[PDB]
Symmetry: D2
Subunit: 264 residues, 4 copies
């Protein structure tokens, strides 16, 4: 089929990419970076996140694969030495696909009335423009809390091992269609009160963050982060869209967690 290979850009990953392209030339495989059906990422999890956002408009037509030239990644979970066996199985096809849930983020603005939507593979976070961060947290149209602190992080399941984990969040197996909200340095005293605990939401629950004082926020989506002005609302929901991985062996999530944090 059609395929493309993205590279971290260092000597190691570029050469592996050129050797894989040569190996694909021995099969009915066409290099196409406009409408690929297979997207191979060579580098780390950062490289894999860039590949996902490169092709986020053709998610349902693409199976992703990650190769780690550095340490083991959670998305880039193939070794460089397995590259030749990867070509053959990819060329033959008949592989299985695995799907992970994604996070939908909607940003509504003031001035007039317009929206922007983004898809996250790891998480979306909200912080302030330097000043104090105060937002009302609304869950399914019910006011839940007034958050004062540094920010908030909404993670996908496969994102729970990333930023979510550093904030105290739970690690969730990616077969659970859910999103998880964690706090960044919340203020809790006699007059200010947050839940503290991470919150895990199922499909069709909508979490809305609404400004109190300032309308300017730093909003990140995976590695992309930008200052949004005149923001009226930020809505989080489990996406109906899913990222599809090509799978060729059993590499269970909990072993990947074991290998990344316990020992390898």
């Amino acid at each position: 089929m059609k395929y493309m290979i993205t590279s971290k850009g260092d000597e190691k990953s570029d050469l592996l990419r050129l050797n894989m392209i040569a190996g694909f030339g021995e099969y009915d495989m066409e290099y196409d970076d406009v409408e690929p059906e297979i997207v191979i990422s060579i580098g780390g999890d950062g490289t894999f996140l860039s590949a996902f956002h490169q092709y986020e408009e053709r998610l349902d037509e693409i199976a992703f694969i990650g190769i780690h030239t550095g340490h083991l990644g959670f998305y880039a979970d193939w070794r460089p030495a397995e590259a030749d066996k990867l070509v053959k199985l990819l060329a033959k096809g008949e592989y299985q696909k695995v799907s992970y849930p994604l996070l939908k983020t909607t940003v509504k603005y003031g001035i007039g009335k317009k929206e922007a939507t983004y898809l996250a593979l790891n998480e979306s976070t909200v912080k302030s423009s330097g000043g104090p961060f105060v937002v009302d947290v609304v869950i399914n149209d019910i006011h839940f809390e007034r958050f004062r602190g540094d920010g908030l992080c909404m993670s996908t399941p496969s994102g729970t091992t990333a930023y979510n984990k550093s904030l105290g969040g739970a690690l969730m197996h990616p077969s659970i269609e859910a999103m998880q909200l964690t706090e960044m340095a919340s203020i809790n005293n006699r007059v200010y009160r947050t839940i503290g605990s991470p919150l895990v939401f199922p499909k069709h629950h909508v979490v809305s963050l609404q400004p109190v004082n300032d309308k300017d926020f730093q909003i990140s989506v995976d590695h992309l982060s930008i200052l949004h002005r005149d923001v009226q609302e930020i809505r989080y929901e489990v996406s109906a869209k899913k990222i599809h991985f090509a799978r060729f062996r059993s590499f269970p999530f909990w072993r990947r967690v074991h290998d990344s944090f316990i020992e390898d």
Copy 2:
């Protein structure tokens, strides 16, 4: 239908129970504490947990209701003043049912070879008999970690607001069929290593705790706690069984969380 009412045993709850029995006498409602179809608990969440374990062999034939004579409970979420409206709607029927997932705990012994199974509505925990607690944690037959510490807690979704919450766990909406494992004071240094983070498992995942040095453990299931000796394995899995609640109004889980921890 057939119904029974359990009471915390204080003057307030006993009198409310006698007044509800009188109110049921005005309808085709028969008091039966052997094969009830409706189980009303009057007291707190402790009273409701005792009612659940009272009738755990007829879970699929019972709809539970909780009335809180003290503060708001997560299971006992009806006010005493609503008792009269409760009788009528219960007597008429046509109510909806809501189902929450449960936790299955299997305890395998040595000596010969035998098993015991228990059902938890909140959580099951494992601690040592005074000595150091060391257990190997195995996830789907894969050795995940060697835990050294005070103990481990496996929570249901509706249990996440209880012991799980005090241990740093995430709060999970009860519509998610999952269980959550949290650590109690894990030892982490150069030679000893745990994941630290809470872990959230889906249906059909099996978490096994296996002894290393001692075979004696204090194992709790909700409020019940007992010293198990000659223990070879403790297995945790999302139960196929569910507790059914009678519902008459919308009282969302996240508002119940709000009312219990933020403000009311």
Copy 3:
């Protein structure tokens, strides 16, 4: 003596300030905001922090007092209704003084070679300019760790109830001459490793933060926060200087903690 009164600027605090000035006019008390010996702050803890940094060059010649027109503050711990009794005792004098330790922050730059020093009453923090925050942490010239995360917070004892507390830090009685370092969302996996725990340092210990990749950081000192460029080192040490409070009654730190976080 000479005295000045700073105000939050709202109607309540301005009027209390004018009434106290009138009350001081009945005694040998001269209003002087250039070389005061008594500095009264009327507002909240934010107002008190501004007063401290207003007069940080004459710390050893000044006794500070805080009045809270809003809720109880940790520095602004007098009620407005006590204002008249405050004037008399302040005018008579013979009061006792209480001293709290402070934090010294030294910022060394590249380009050529120059330093800047700041004094913190609550804390000093370090974050990155948007990009990833990576710094080497050196304790008394010994490399202790390579920190990857959102940032670091170095707190005084009286600062431990502020930002430090939201980051998981311990609350320290202000009679202990010490500083406390806490982490903001540290990355910990197989290859990256921080201590995790807050660290409490005594007098004469020097903690140095040294850049790895980028030399630009957002450095805050109490409420003041600014982007420092070409930074070569940030050094933290318990200051030899102390802030002096005028005290007229016993209001113990742990009761102030109780009143602010438990109940009042």
Copy 4:
């Protein structure tokens, strides 16, 4: 001088002990385990804790040394290969001494009226006899909080790297004369409230734990743990007594922390 050597009891530590005794026989050094002035512990930190409590009645007449035959310990911080150089320097004398603060625990009983005092090198903890743990926490005769949870831990400075650390406590340099209180799984909801944060107390502050419902508690002091009945009060204070170490090289606390938790 007079000296004794305690051993973990395994083949490695016993043989090292016999070789050191032989080496001391070449100097004016007398083996005496009744009134030693030098106490050498060969094993791990557990072995060193037993040696401390062995000779806790002659603390001011004893300099302790630890040798680790397993991994590095915080008290047993000499390698076995350094044993011969240890003998010579110990025999010659002229060494320096380093002193660490200790924790005093007083247990007052009912029935009649009697007290017991204990000294801790790491920590003292309080847990319940199975039932719920509820205690009133009083700081310098001021009621601070009503604690509901699994238990409480009061740590010395050198104890902060042990149990305290697993409970979220700060690591404190042992030159600070202080004690640190940490919570074990506190209950916090609308009606029950604890501070949450670790608390660090200076010398002469007295923390008192007082029973509410039950008078039976499991009280530990370092590795010793026993069920106390008819308990009326448990009082914690920084001891006036100090443990003295013989020091022959610079091995800073923060490097020892680095070596034990970061890398070695």
